[PDB]
Amino acid sequence: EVQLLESGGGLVQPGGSLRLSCAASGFTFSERAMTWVRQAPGKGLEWVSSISGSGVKTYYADSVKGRFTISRDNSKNTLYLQMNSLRAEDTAVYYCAKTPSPKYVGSVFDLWGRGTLVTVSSASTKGPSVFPLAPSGGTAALGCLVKDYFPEPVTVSWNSGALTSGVHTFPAVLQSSGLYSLSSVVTVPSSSLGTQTYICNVNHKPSNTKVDKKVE
Amino acid sequence: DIQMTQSPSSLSASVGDRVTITCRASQSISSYLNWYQQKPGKAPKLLIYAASSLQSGVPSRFSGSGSGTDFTLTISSLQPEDFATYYCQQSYSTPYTFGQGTKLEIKRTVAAPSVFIFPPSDEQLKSGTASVVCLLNNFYPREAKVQWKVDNALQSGNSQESVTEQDSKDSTYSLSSTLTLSKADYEKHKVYACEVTHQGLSSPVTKSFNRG
Amino acid sequence: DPLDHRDAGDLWFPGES
């Protein structure tokens, strides 16, 4: 019934701007304080900003004060985070959260949205190259190296979704190039090699890269 | 700001187990402490508010208590759905601050990694870089050490490791380690070796290939 | 529960520890 859904975000340059939006359904929006919380890749949770139901009172983390503005439109059930002077500090998944704040309880983030990714970098959008991971007992491994893309995310399947068991797709790493890389691997019978074709399917929507890579 | 320190950072336990996660505040915050649960690839959810009060739909096996600077989250009889990362969060004052998190993973039978090494492709070399990959597959526990050796010389700090979340079928992990060199550096050495140490191995396992 | 109490929607803060 109750739902929050974040829009906006994407890749921006340092010094740049964004506006996140959060659409509320299934509760009386004007009666509830709302909050933005963010989560940097592979890190914990950090409070960004909160706003009273009325929109009159705002509150900010010191690191974002006078760069970010929290606002809301009670008429259209929408919460905003306007972001200015962005820096890489700000790269994170941003969540909006309904914030009841009862007397003798304080603020509680009782319902959270799905999250939207903000990436701040001097690097421009770049599609990956997809290289094979091949052998140089009974189990063998193969995979695809999805190298030098930006920003996140990428998705990988195998044999167009016909192969899923024994599949592992790793979280990306940030390289010294400032670009991402990840691998997706599968284990198969060593017998089945050179007999059945294994294909990895890589989608990087930011660059409109969509690749099928024959591995073996 | 009010610094929140959770203990432990990481916790391995089994179904049926009773575990306690501690959260300490750098100053008194009375009972204004919430707990959240987060599963991989998902947003957090509220578990407990004001130290002790259960959110609707949270099982009674979760209990919290504390007031001042020391707080406890006790999960009695752990169930499979309870394995997750847990955060505390103070609401005494802005800025609202969170603990660094406690990753609660499920224990299972030790499993040594299956180790695989992959050479750079010709396609990559033509591009002017060379990435060598070592896979540690389907192992438990998470703690593994990968030591690259290039013509017998130890490497350290020049590879990138990534680990999967605990597998939903069998509660194992996998790990990838990527060694990246310029085409030139790659073509100056012969033997590329990945040497693996893990609880499940009585001595290290080495996978190697000679360039070509 | 208190999360349901309809109030003006302001943040509440305690006046003592």
CB A147 within 8 A of CB A181: yes
Task: Give the distance, in angstroms, between the CA of residue A54 and the centroid of all CA atoms in the same chain.
Answer: 30
Q: Whole domain around residue A53: which residue ranges?
A: 3-120
In chain B, which residues have their Cβ closer than 8 Å to the Cβ of A115? 43
Closest residue of chain B to C16, computed from CA coordinates: B30
B19/chain C closest Cα distance in angstroms:
27
Q: Do A185 and B135 touch (CB under 8 A)?
A: yes
The number of helices, as runs of H, and strands, as runs of E, in chain A is: 0, 19
**Domain check: are B98 and B8 in the same one?**
yes
> What is the interface size between B and C, counted as CB pairs within 8 Å?
19
Q: How many domains does chain B have?
A: 2
B56 vs C: CB within 8 A:
yes
**Domain check: are B132 and B171 in the same one?**
yes
Task: Give the distance, in angstroms, between the CA of residue A180 and the centroid of all CA atoms in the same chain.
Answer: 13
Q: How many alpha carbons lie under 13 Å from residue B29 in its C-beta half-sphere? A: 33
A4 vs B: CB within 8 A:
no
**Domain check: are A8 and A114 in the same one?**
yes
**Domain check: are A149 and A111 in the same one?**
no
Q: Of B106, B133, B153, which residue is a domain's last? A: B106
Method: X-ray
Closest residue of chain C to A35, computed from CA coordinates: C11
Q: How many domains does chain A have?
A: 2
**Domain check: are A64 and A101 in the same one?**
yes
Q: Who's near B184: CB < 8 A, 6+ residues apart?
A: none
**Domain check: are A15 and A116 in the same one?**
yes
Q: Whole domain around residue B158: which residue ranges?
A: 114-210
**Domain check: are B152 and B199 in the same one?**
yes
**Domain check: are A109 and A139 in the same one?**
no
User: Maximum distance among all alpha carbons in chain A?
Assistant: 68
* Order of all β-strands in the sheet with B159-163: B114-118, B129-139, B173-182, B159-163
**Domain check: are A11 and A107 in the same one?**
yes
Q: Of B45, B71, B106, which residue is a domain's last? A: B106
Give the C-alpha separation, A132 to A182, whole Å.
12
Tell how strand A116-120 and strand A18-25 pair up. Answer: unpaired
Give the C-alpha separation, A71 to A79, whole Å.
6
**Domain check: are A207 and A140 in the same one?**
yes
Cα–Cα distances in Å, from A131 out to A107, A136, A174, A200, B127? 49, 14, 17, 10, 11
- Break positions in chain C: residue before each gap, C to N over 2.5 angstroms: none
In chain C, which residues have their Cβ closer than 8 Å to the Cβ of B49? 3
Amino acid type, A82? Q
Per-residue DSSP letter, B140 = B
**Domain check: are A79 and A155 in the same one?**
no
**Domain check: are A110 and A12 in the same one?**
yes
Q: Give me the DSSP letters along B39-68.
A: -TTS--EEEEETTTEEPTT--TTEEEEE-S
B53/chain C closest Cα distance in angstroms:
9
Q: Of B84, B106, B128, which residue is a domain's last? A: B106
Amino acid type, B120? P
CB atoms within 10 A of CB B79: 11
B29 vs C: CB within 8 A:
yes
**Domain check: are B127 and B44 in the same one?**
no
B129/chain C closest Cα distance in angstroms:
54
Q: What is the CATH number of the domain that holds A207?
A: 2.60.40.10
Closest CA to B114 of A140, A103, A61: A140
Q: Who's near A7: CB < 8 A, 6+ residues apart?
A: A20, A21, A22, A23, A116
Resolution of this PDB entry, in A? 1.8
Q: Of A77, A95, A120, which residue is a domain's last? A: A120
**Domain check: are B99 and B185 in the same one?**
no
Angle CA B98–A105–B83, to nearest 5: 45
B155 vs A: CB within 8 A:
no
Closest CA to A96 of A76, A77, A120: A77
Phi/psi at A103 (5° precision):
-65, 140
Q: Do B49 and C13 touch (CB under 8 A)?
A: no
Tokens 């309870």 -> residue: B82
Instruction: Report the SS3 class of residue B12.
Output: strand
Task: Give the distance, in angstroms, between the CA of residue A96 and the centroid of all CA atoms in the same chain.
Answer: 14
Q: Do A168 and B123 touch (CB under 8 A)?
A: no
* Helix then strand then coil, % of chain B, to nearest 5: 5, 50, 40
In chain C, which residues have their Cβ closer than 8 Å to the Cβ of A50? 11
**Domain check: are A23 and A42 in the same one?**
yes
Q: What is the CATH number of the domain that holds B28?
A: 2.60.40.10
Q: Who's near B153: CB < 8 A, 6+ residues apart?
A: none
In chain B, which residues have their Cβ closer than 8 Å to the Cβ of C4? none
Nearest by CB to A108, which of B49, B164, B209? B49
Closest CA to A150 of A173, A183, A116: A173
Instruction: Report the SS3 class of residue A30.
Output: helix
**Domain check: are B20 and B68 in the same one?**
yes
Tell how strand A116-120 and strand A10-12 pair up. Answer: parallel
Q: Do A33 and C2 touch (CB under 8 A)?
A: no
